[model samples]
Target: MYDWFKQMRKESPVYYDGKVWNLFKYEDCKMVLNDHKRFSSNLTGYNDKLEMLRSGKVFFDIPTRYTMLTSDPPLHDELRNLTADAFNPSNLPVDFVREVTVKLLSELDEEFDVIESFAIPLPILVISKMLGINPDVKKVKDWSDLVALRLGRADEIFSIGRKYLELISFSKKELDSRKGKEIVDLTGKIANSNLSELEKEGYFILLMIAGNETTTNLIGNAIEDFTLYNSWDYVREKGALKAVEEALRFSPPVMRTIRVTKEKVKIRDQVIDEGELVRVWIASANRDEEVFKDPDSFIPDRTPNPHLSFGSGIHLCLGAPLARLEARIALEEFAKKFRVKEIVKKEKIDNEVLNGYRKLVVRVERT
Candidate 1:
């Protein structure tokens, strides 16, 4: 499924596209990501790099919403604490889990796309609840949709981000009248790090958008892999958890992340200079034959699976446990609802970084 993609990553994990040079070697990438001192996520130091990232907007520019993901330590550490305290797995409300699963599957009528049917809606609902946005607010709903669209249209996405900034501004002004103790009262949380309005907005946009989108792609890829293995019917009849995990390992979404060297580092023989960028190849590392007993096989119940689909070290995805639970419940619900009738190969979608099925034509029938 990923033959050509693998070839490119292997040949030149680190390549220059006119301006930005990327490193692909796994060891090198990890070193950059883990080296907080050497490689900083904060975007002020490098003028040229910041300019390039601003073009993407996802990697550069500040947040418009009250988000906690993109900031660096002290501030980053504090928000991480707030979110972790608020969204831990041990405290997962059973009602939320069941409600999300039921709502998602109920919408999946005949021949619906999994990305929309399950992944997108599930996380959006979860985050919406956390953000205390009214369920009926189409304005708020669109806040997340455009960000998760991932159509590679940065202008459109950033415009969606702009609305969030507007929302935050309005909310802050009206904070004096905000009602009693709410479940997820973001307005009450004092802005500790002293981030600008745009920066918070950017974070808010990223959290909702990327949170929903990453889960969407994961489920989409899972279903695609299940159909490929002709095991959707089996999952329905036997075990859905095994099926979903197999799918995750089979086709992970959001392959790798970029980390610039914060300081001088040595990896094996190569010496990486400070400020060099390394593109951590999460996919290749996950599929390493050395690490995984049989890298090519999709064993549904593969024990000791140590796939870093979310990422690792300090920047590990804050929403990992929530995502896992949601994906598990999602596949379970999908299995209960339908069996894959057939899958048709369609036009493959490709950008520079993302790797997954873009145009999967599946003929799904009611069970």
Candidate 2:
């Protein structure tokens, strides 16, 4: 994939292949992400067109209505601010995160699948606790998996429509139960916010899915990168924080994001008309030779790492701080307790938009 990105960056940095404009270089990707006025996040028109195209089919309706992901500020800021305090790294329950990490790590055997046992459950438990929902990891994992699939593979929505609808119903029930209560969590925050009922439900569903999925992938990617690059001892010797940062740059959970052109925009000779979708390859930009010293090597303590894994501008990932905290703690604890003997088996996720493992089985030994 990096090879392909390298080729694209050298050949067609700003290539428009009829449908969507693909931005490959760091500067170009950064511009599209930061300059929201020229490149809007509001893809309602595009989404509506997609829905219309699949009108006759059992389309699982995406909650784009008042969603922060697809909205431009001041609405975006408003929605983001509603739960900003809850997600703040300082405000987050660091003790709780460490507890979850330790608990999950303790339960692991000498050989186990990291994705199913550790990476997947750690974030799910933390997010569920933060959202003040049931600590049923299996239920939340199922729903989150479906939502993630829908986001990346829209063509498979009909197949997963039943499970998606169940997720929506479950979110609504959870929100209703928290209404007017003094509960203190993300769900309570959304429930008591000025948002409409539907909007509240949308936000609930968003947090439920967004809160854990990417973070899970981040942990998985970090472990995979450390093992692949033989950085386990480095993490143990130096620390896990810098390794986590490098992992985010080397293998971001989200490979790319889409935005729509608000008006005519030109980039280095290519012109993109209004309303055309622009696919910003974050993974490509992070590996740009112009930005980093050694663009391909995975340095654990790479300084001045300005990776766009959490994205840029107003729509930056709301759960970034939490994700970082979780990954850092998970890695730190894992390095302290175990050494990677062997990566027994690994499987990449079958999604272009998301870049992480679907299964990562590993053999470990106590350090």
Candidate 3:
């Protein structure tokens, strides 16, 4: 699947060096992620995402485009540190994870939608529940689903923009009432800021987009992969933590991310000019055959996975440790009670950005 990188790497391992190397093998990706300046996540004008601050939506285009994911250097460093305290892993509720496992068992009815009821909600509930949002936050999924469709046209972006605005208004009002001095969501902290409304809006959008979107995709993709590889047997035998890593390798929900060039560069002996685009292909990297034998296969305990599903370097997912803890709890509970024998797995939705089994109907003879 990632032939372009492997095939081309021999001639240009560091594709962005010497010349403008556009792509390379997974091995090369590891090397490149280490070179922060050469391959800054903030390509383009280095402020392209900052430009999104003006997009004015809170759901998809505006919010999704406004987070730490798109920034590089000082801004990335500053904001990550700013919000890191509230997300301290030590502060996470042990019982919340305990509840997730139990909750999965309780929801095990026949023909459950994994995306809707299982995978999607696992991370959603974690993020929302931690922030004291109602347990029944069905609208979190609704708004993201509505606005995430990539129409790739101005009019479509505009439609999504308006949806974000409505969602933002609702969030502000609802959360304001629910908020107290002890609030921890980055959104809650920023709302109290005396900064310009634009600054507050930017932080608000950043936290929510990061909070649930990538996570929903990750959980859904994990469930679908287990079904695809007959790994339920492996997971049943080994455990759910192993299954989660297998999912990270088998299906990286966040596939392709684009970074703009900060300076003139050469890749594959070809100069890409000063201002250009570099697409970081996560799926391509995850599936590189040279890195993982039978890269398409799912194996539990594939230790030291070295997968970039959560990305790498200083910008590595700060919420990673928390995410892993939650996924493990969700899957452990999901597998313990659900038969998984009748899992009807199909990719419910597809777009160029992320991928997952949107509709996973499992007949659960609840135990």
Best by TM-score: 2
Model 3: residues with Cα > 4 Å off, grouped in runs: 1-24, 43-65, 151-161, 171-185, 193-195
* Local accuracy of candidate 3 as per-residue lDDT tens digits, 18-105: 3334454575466556566766776323245454443643323343344455567776676677667666778766687768758665
Reference-based TM-score of each model: 0.76, 0.93, 0.81
* Ten contiguous residues minimizing lDDT sum, candidate 3: 151-160
Residues 1-367 of candidate 1: C-alpha lDDT, one tens digit per residue? 2564356456755565553455444455555566666676654333233334435444433343234443467656755665565557886555786787886677655665555446556776776666555444345446544444443443453353566566555444433333334324433332322344344344444555565656766777777777777666676667666666556656766676665666776654456677776556677666655566677787777777766666767777877777777777777677777777876554433643455555555666766
RMSD of each: 5.6, 4.0, 4.7
What is the clash count for each candidate, in the order shown? 18, 0, 13
lDDT order, best first, reads: 2, 3, 1
Q: Each candidate's lDDT (Cα)?
A: 0.58, 0.83, 0.63
Q: Write the per-residue lDDT of candidate 2 for residues 1-367, one digit (tens) a residue.
A: 8999999999999987776789999999898899999999877542343334324343344553436787777677878888888887779989999997898888888999999999999998888888887778998888877767665574563343677778777777888888899458888888777665556777888888888888889999998899889998888888888889899999999999999888998988987888788999999999999998798999998988999999988788888888989999999898899889889999998888878899999999978
lDDT of 2: 0.83
